[PDB]
């Protein structure tokens, strides 16, 4: 199988926690070591930690948490587990650290995540964002997470201001989060997402291509991938961004208004992603996306 999508063990030293649509990835660094990856959303907290107890004897064996994104997709789980874990370094991009430090962004992220909760659950006690146990990482910093983990951080700007991607050199694994976009559940082809810049996004995808052939490509939506498509995932996301550029430019030349394509594209794509993202914000988000595409890269 290609989309190794189920929870539990995935590879020799990799397990998926919680729901696949917003995964929380765990790495076996050694004998009494662990390291979460990709973060999570706020609603799944009592789920995700409850799965952690299956794969970890006791939570202290974690040492590092890798976060790849600023948005609500993956920062939501952080304040609701860090008090439980006695110690973990929330390794994340330097520009994202200022985002957590600011009071403005946390309002948006926490309110948006609280919108996603079920009618029952209230979250447990959680520390303020400023007191996160965080250590920034710049471009190219060699994260010696363990004996069998030499990960390189690459700053894949464009999808957000700050989106970094982690790449295990030894197993040719790559947690890209949303940089490659969003792997479509059904139709297979990649799905671009650019929300804050376009010209930098193609540069990031070029650097992702420049990384060697990928045994395992891992986005932050839809679980792990393997095989032929994961190898040229970097090329295909670039190509899909150009395809959406062509679609928007053709529609603009034909004279159909901007938002009508956004509504049609929302109707096309939002169904698989409904369970983490209410549609009213989905429309505005992809409206912003098509606005950036219309602005840049003729």
């Amino acid at each position: 199988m290609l989309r190794l999508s189920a929870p539990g063990q995935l590879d020799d030293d990799l397990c998926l926690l919680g729901d696949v649509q917003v995964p929380v990835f765990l790495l076996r660094l050694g004998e009494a070591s662990w390291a979460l990856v990709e973060g999570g959303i706020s609603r799944d907290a009592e789920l995700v930690w409850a799965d952690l107890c299956r794969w970890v004897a006791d939570p202290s064996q974690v040492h590092y948490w890798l976060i790849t994104h600023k948005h609500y997709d993956h920062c939501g789980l952080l304040p609701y587990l860090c008090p439980r874990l006695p110690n973990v370094q929330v390794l994340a991009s330097e520009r994202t650290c200022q985002a957590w430090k600011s009071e403005s962004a946390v309002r948006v992220v926490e309110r948006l995540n609280r919108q996603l909760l079920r009618a029952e659950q209230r979250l447990p006690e959680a520390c303020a964002w400023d007191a996160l146990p965080v250590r920034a990482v710049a471009d190219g910093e060699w994260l010696e997470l363990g004996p069998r983990h030499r990960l390189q951080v690459i700053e894949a700007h464009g999808h957000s201001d700050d989106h970094v991607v982690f790449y295990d050199v030894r197993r040719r694994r790559l947690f890209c989060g949303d940089a490659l976009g969003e792997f479509d559940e059904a139709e297979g082809v990649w799905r671009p997402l650019v929300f804050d810049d376009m010209e930098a996004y193609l540069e990031s995808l070029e650097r992702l291509q420049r990384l060697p052939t990928l045994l395992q490509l891992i986005p932050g939506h839809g679980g792990l991938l393997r095989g032929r498509l994961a190898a040229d995932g970097a090329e295909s996301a670039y190509t899909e961004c150009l395809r959406l550029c062509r679609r928007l430019l053709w529609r603009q030349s034909m004279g159909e208004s901007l938002d009508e394509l956004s509504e049609e594209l929302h109707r096309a794509w939002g169904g698989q992603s409904v369970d983490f993202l209410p549609g009213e914000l989905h429309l505005g988000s992809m409206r912003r996306m098509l606005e950036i595409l219309s602005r840049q890269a003729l």
């Binding site: 190219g140 060699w142 069998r148 040719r172 070029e206 420049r210 060697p212 052939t213």
Partner: protein, 241 residues
């Protein structure tokens, strides 16, 4: 042209990153960065001269621990190494194996002892006839056959650009006995290499025998040699003729 992207895009990116660097340590630093990004711990770029025939000196730089470099330069394992000599046999990349170094096992015991067990080495003959090798190495995770071709092409691109710029920056590594024969001394040394004696070369050139003898003396002192066999052999080896 934006249809395959991939490896060609990597090659253009590495060339752009490599070009403005002008400090040799910077060049090795970026190469070290690249070979870390492939998943291999250590690298080593070596150059085998052919100047001293009896004991061909082999100048090497890289990042293995420094006492192991001392083990090389004291016990002189460069000549006995068959990873370097594989370039003379063929232009094939060769992964390391206990079978490969059956000729010389002390090297393999020392290497496997000293934190190098898995690795490979790509030879190449530089255009000036200085057989060069680029080796890469790691501890665990034996090289998979699925992996090997990508390491092969990427190492070939790396050593091509590397030896190009190390030629450009005139490193100590590749400087030969610097000799610059102009046209007529190049011709006469060439003809001496073709075995024609002084009389034959003189009469076909119609130049006086003692004049060409003095030209041989100039060539003699230029290489600091006692006999024309040295002149002919070295001129052949270094491509001056």
């Amino acid at each position: 042209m934006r249809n395959d992207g991939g490896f060609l895009l990597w090659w253009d990116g590495l060339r752009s990153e490599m070009q403005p660097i002008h400090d040799s340590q910077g060049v090795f630093a970026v190469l070290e960065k690249e070979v870390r990004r492939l998943g291999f711990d250590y690298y080593a770029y070596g150059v085998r001269h052919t100047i001293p025939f009896t004991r061909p000196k082999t100048e090497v730089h890289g990042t293995y621990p420094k006492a192991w470099l001392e083990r090389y330069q004291m016990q002189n394992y460069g000549a006995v190494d068959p990873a370097i000599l594989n370039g003379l046999r063929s232009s094939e990349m060769v992964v390391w194996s206990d079978s490969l170094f059956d000729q010389s096992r002390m090297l393999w015991n020392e290497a496997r002892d000293w934190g190098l067990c898995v690795g490979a080495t790509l030879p190449i003959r530089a255009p000036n006839n200085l057989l060069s090798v680029l080796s890469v190495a790691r501890d665990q995770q034996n090289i998979s056959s699925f992996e090997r071709e990508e390491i092969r092409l990427r190492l070939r691109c790396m050593i091509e650009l590397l030896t190009q710029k190390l030629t450009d920056l005139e490193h100590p590594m590749l400087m030969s006995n610097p000799v610059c024969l102009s046209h007529r001394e190049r011709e006469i040394l060439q003809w001496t290499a073709d075995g024609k004696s002084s009389g034959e070369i003189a009469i076909i050139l119609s130049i006086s025998e003692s004049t060409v003898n003095f030209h041989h003396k100039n060539i003699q002192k230029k290489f600091d040699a006692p006999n024309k066999t040295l002149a002919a052999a070295y001129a052949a080896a270094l491509g001056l003729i």
